[PDB]
């Protein structure tokens, strides 16, 4: 039964109960149903008013935070001052493992681009202007900094400096379906050429970033970090949290560590015996 | 115009902040929402589903053998079968469970827990068990007559194949912490031990070694607070195809 | 008792079981045809009803001491079988639910437990390599595959947490059968039958079986019945 639950449930006092035919502590796990036995019926309790809020475990709260989807350091010298990143959430394992707790997701991305400049191995730190253009799937990808593909009449671009606050835009839910597929069992193509699972093809397209200025001054290191905070989140069909470490970002393939914890044979660190404990 | 002045925290990027930002795709209509089964609108819906504890973790148990506890007929009365360390933050039976994996994203926790043990032995197998829970403040009970003194359930095998051991909420505070101290008064949950109440009697035809399967789930009064990064997933050196996405 | 016995009548097929527990409905949903407001493809779909809705028994597998478990992917298991398999070939799209019934029985002197779980969108991995699984590895047809490492569910997740999915247990002490009713689970309202597999039926022996009685083969039989089938895109068969 669906209901509005803003807080944890209160407890009611119970008394000594001995009765035939009534066994609250018995259940059947073969039914695949969690035990419905209440603390009131299992033990003798007192009335407790529980004011503890459940609001912080909401999926809108749990999954919506700024995490690092992409980190790209490109050297700025005479050359090449741009990079094209095919958008995926499988890149960094911190956000990846949290988003994989659900099978399907429907959310709006809020993207933020943090820019920093470093010295290669002092005079001053230059202020550079960077462009971040969002290229949908099936469009022409810029092959050069000064190439004609950066005119971007139809495409969505953004201009920002290093001194200015981080550039921030919102990306709507663009999937052709009702929600994203975190895990996809099958192949995209109608022929055997398709790849198993989601491939960096359909999904969200590309993000192209360059430095708008020409090449000056003498080389510095410019690192572009990209952050994504979901919003308006809908989640379906939760899934077991992954244990073994990741191998590739395009698949689920696993290996496992040499020794526990998170070993292939043993996820939990071993102990002497089930009877062993101080 | 409107006279203004900036405040501290101007231009800062806070990862948890809540604000509206400029849309990059004007006049874009997302795909109409379709009803899909299994919507999770709160994570406490997930933690209340019972999942298998790994009690048998040892160096001699490999793979799936770690999720069952061997129960053999014993020749001495009043014998301990096994015990469950209740520390969720540390590495133990409760870490790989649903209630464990979700709770490790949160620094504080509250509410009752429940354990469920299913006896997978043969139909003709019979026996009585006792599942004890000792509140903190002392060493684990070595013997049953010391362990009875706490919350316990005496269980007899029968048609119903499972029990429910409710671990009640007992604390001096509204919440408990996952801080790395195992014996901390704000951390230690107590101890759970299982003793033979009478004995396990099996016919000569049935297999002598029977296996319990432990479960654990949060209750309806369970709660979590102060979300944090999960220590479970660690750094990963070589991540394949990650560099391929940069062209 | 009341819910220990169950009968399932779909089409010309019928299944009775005298040992069962309270058949499961996945996520509290029950299969239904695609409503008019969720429809996309304009062509009038075809509804075989009693033709394609009935129990198709899959090849039984032998439960042995070192068995790791079995999986069947749907529809893929049903694509070659019966009138269901013909509509799959001639039509471009389908929408249906599934009713899965697993039969495993033994004498009261056998001990063992099976975890029968339907994993929505199960993406399989490969052990100790970066190479994505091939087509023939994932698609086994009717016979289905076998878990290499059932402890991790072959995807790297935990078998301990597999109860979050729709599931039932077959405990050789209690019940000899498990029943799960699966609605249509997909992001898209209809789907291409050959490439994409919505559900993965996974039978895993959490507790193996052993006894001191004279040994005998214990098979595990699976009966899968489609429900509320629709099809669009009538054309020639792929064959």
């Amino acid at each position: 039964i669906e209901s509005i639950i803003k807080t944890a449930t209160d407890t009611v006092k119970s008394e000594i109960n001995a009765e035939l035919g009534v066994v609250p502590s018995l259940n059947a796990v073969e039914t695949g149903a969690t035990s419905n036995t209440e603390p009131e019926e299992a033990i003798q309790t007192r009335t407790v008013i529980n004011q503890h809020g459940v609001s912080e475990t909401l999926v809108e709260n749990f999954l919506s935070r700024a995490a690092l989807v992409s980190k790209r350091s490109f050297e700025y010298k005479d050359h090449k001052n741009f990079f094209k990143w095919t958008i995926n959430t499988r890149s960094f394992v911190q956000l990846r493992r949290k988003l994989e707790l659900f099978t399907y997701l429907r959310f709006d991305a809020e993207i933020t681009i943090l820019t920093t400049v470093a010295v290669n191995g002092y005079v001053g730190l230059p202020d550079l202007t960077l462009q971040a253009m969002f290229v949908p799937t099936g469009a022409l990808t810029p092959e050069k900094q000064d190439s004609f593909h950066w005119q971007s009449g139809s495409n969505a671009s953004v201009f920002f400096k290093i001194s200015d606050p981080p550039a921030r835009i919102t990306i709507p839910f663009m999937c052709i379906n009702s929600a994203y597929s975190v895990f996809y069992d099958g192949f995209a193509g109608f022929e055997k050429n398709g790849l198993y699972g989601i491939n960096p093809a359909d999904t969200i397209g590309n993000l192209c970033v360059r430095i708008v200025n020409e090449h000056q001054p003498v080389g510095f290191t410019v690192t572009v970090r990209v952050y994504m905070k979901p919003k308006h989140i809908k989640a379906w069909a939760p899934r077991p949290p992954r244990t073994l470490p990741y191998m590739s970002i395009a698949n689920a393939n696993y290996k496992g560590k040499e020794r526990a914890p998170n070993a292939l044979s043993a996820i939990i660190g071993n102990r002497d015996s089930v009877k062993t404990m101080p | 115009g409107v006279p203004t002045y900036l405040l501290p925290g101007s231009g800062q990027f806070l990862t948890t902040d809540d604000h509206s930002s400029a849309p990059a795709l004007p006049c874009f209509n997302p795909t109409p929402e379709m009803h899909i089964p299994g919507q999770v609108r709160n994570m406490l819906e997930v933690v209340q589903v019972e999942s298998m504890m790994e009690i048998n973790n040892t160096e001699s148990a490999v793979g799936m053998e770690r999720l069952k506890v061997d129960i053999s007929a014993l020749t001495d009365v009043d014998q301990l079968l096994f015990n469950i360390p209740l520390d969720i933050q540390l590495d133990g039976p409760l870490r790989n469970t649903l209630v464990g994996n979700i709770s490790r994203y949160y620094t504080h926790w509250s509410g009752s827990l429940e354990m469920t043990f299913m006896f997978c032995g043969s139909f003709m197998a019979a026996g009585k068990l006792i599942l004890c829970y000792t509140p903190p403040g002392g060493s684990c009970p070595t013997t049953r007559e010391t362990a009875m003194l706490g919350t316990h359930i005496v269980w007899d095998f029968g048609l119903q194949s499972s029990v429910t051991l409710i671990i009640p909420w007992i604390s001096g505070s509204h919440y408990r912490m996952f801080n790395n101290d195992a014996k901390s008064t704000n951390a230690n949950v107590g101890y759970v031990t299982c003793f033979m109440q009478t004995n396990l009697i099996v016919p000569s035809e049935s297999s002598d070694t029977c296996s319990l399967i432990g479960f654990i789930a949060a209750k309806d009064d369970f709660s979590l607070r102060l979300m944090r990064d999960s220590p479970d997933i660690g750094q990963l050196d070589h991540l394949h195809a990650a560099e391929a996405a940069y062209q | 008792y009341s819910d220990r016995v169950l009968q399932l009548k779909l089409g010309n097929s019928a299944i009775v079981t005298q040992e069962a527990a309270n058949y499961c409905c996945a996520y509290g949903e029950w299969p239904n045809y695609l409503p008019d407001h969720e429809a996309v493809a304009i062509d009038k779909p075809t509804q075989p009803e009693t033709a394609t809705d009935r129990f198709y028994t899959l090849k039984s597998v032998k439960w042995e001491t070192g068995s790791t478990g079995w999986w069947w992917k749907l529809p893929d298991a049903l694509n070659n079988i019966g009138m269901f398999g013909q509509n799959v070939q001639h039509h471009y799209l389908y929408r249906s639910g599934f009713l899965i019934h697993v039969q495993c029985n033994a004498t009261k002197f056998h001990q063992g437990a099976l975890l029968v779980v339907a994993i929505p969108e199960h993406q399989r991995g490969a052990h100790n390599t970066n190479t994505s699984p091939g087509f023939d590895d994932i698609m086994k047809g009717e016979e289905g595959g076998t878990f290499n490492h059932p402890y991790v569910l072959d995807d790297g997740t935990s078998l301990a947490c597999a109860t979050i999915f729709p599931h039932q247990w077959i405990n050789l002490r209690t019940n000899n059968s498990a029943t799960i009713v699966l609605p249509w689970m997909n992001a898209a309202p209809m789907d291409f039958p050959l490439r994409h597999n919505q559900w993965t039926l996974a039978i895993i022996p959490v507790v193996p079986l052993g006894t001191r009685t004279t040994s005998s083969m214990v098979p595990i039989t699976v009966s899968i019945a489609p429900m509320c089938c629709e099809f669009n895109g009538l054309r020639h068969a792929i064959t």
Epitope: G189, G194, L195, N199, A201 | H240, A241 | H127, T131, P133
Partner: antibody, heavy 119, light 108 residues
Framework: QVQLQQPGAELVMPGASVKMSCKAS????????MHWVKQRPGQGLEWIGA????????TYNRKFKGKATLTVDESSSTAYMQLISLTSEDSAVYYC????????????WGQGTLVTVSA | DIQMTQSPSSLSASLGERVSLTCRAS??????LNWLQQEPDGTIKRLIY???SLDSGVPKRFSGSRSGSDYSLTISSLESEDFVDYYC?????????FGAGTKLELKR
């Protein structure tokens, strides 16, 4: 240190069977995947299949399904390839290479064996 | 089956001349590719792994890069022993496929 050598493959009559033996040494045998490649005198390469050394698990190319059968022995640290339905078209040079997730596969190779038939 | 199209199938060059070898990937295979050098005796020796790096102990005459879907094996300066059949492997997905190959000959 690390070496791969497979002997044998001299003369086999058509319709008979042949058992390839490729021995591995210099590392932990169960920590790496095993691959098989054939080369005809036509100099083109085809990929027979790969066996997971961790257990029996095997992956084949669709063309060689039922023609080739891969098996290993964890003790001898050797990998076997069972070729049935032997024909003159099956005569070629067969290779065995290592594998595994880290630092890409096919880091090491074998000597190769030219199979011939006598009719 | 992702088909690796290797071109050109043959070439002719003299000593100390820069040559390149390109393989096509129909479906995107990412960064996963291997360049294989097979000496006339039948011994195969890998050169480039994951297109990024070179094997240990292999001369630096060989380089590799990805531009779009093109995977280029560039040789700075040819040598007498460097005329042999070259191959490109894809470990991205099963089954693994090989390029058609390229033969190197000396100008006469």
């Amino acid at each position: 240190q690390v070496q791969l050598q497979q002997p044998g493959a001299e003369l086999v009559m058509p319709g008979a069977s042949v058992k390839m033996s490729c021995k591995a040494s210099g590392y932990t045998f169960t920590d790496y995947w095993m691959h098989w490649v054939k080369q005809r005198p036509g100099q083109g390469l085809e990929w027979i299949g790969a066996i997971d050394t961790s257990d029996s698990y095997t992956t084949y190319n669709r063309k060689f399904k039922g023609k080739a059968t891969l098996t290993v022995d964890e003790s001898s640290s050797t990998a076997y390839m069972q070729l049935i339905s032997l024909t003159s078209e099956d005569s070629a040079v067969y290779y065995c290479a290592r594998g595994g997730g880290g630092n890409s596969p096919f880091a090491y190779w074998g000597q190769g064996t030219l199979v011939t038939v006598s009719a | 089956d992702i088909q690796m199209t290797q071109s050109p199938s043959s070439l002719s060059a003299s000593l100390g001349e820069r040559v390149s070898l390109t393989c096509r990937a129909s479906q995107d295979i990412g960064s996963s590719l291997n360049w294989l050098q097979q000496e006339p005796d039948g011994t195969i020796k890998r050169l480039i792994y994951a297109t990024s790096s070179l094997d240990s102990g292999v001369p630096k005459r060989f380089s590799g890069s990805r531009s779009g879907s093109d995977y280029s094996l560039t040789i700075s300066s040819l040598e007498s022993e460097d005329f042999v059949d070259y191959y490109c492997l894809q470990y991205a997905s099963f089954p693994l496929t090989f390029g058609a190959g390229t033969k190197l000959e000396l100008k006469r």
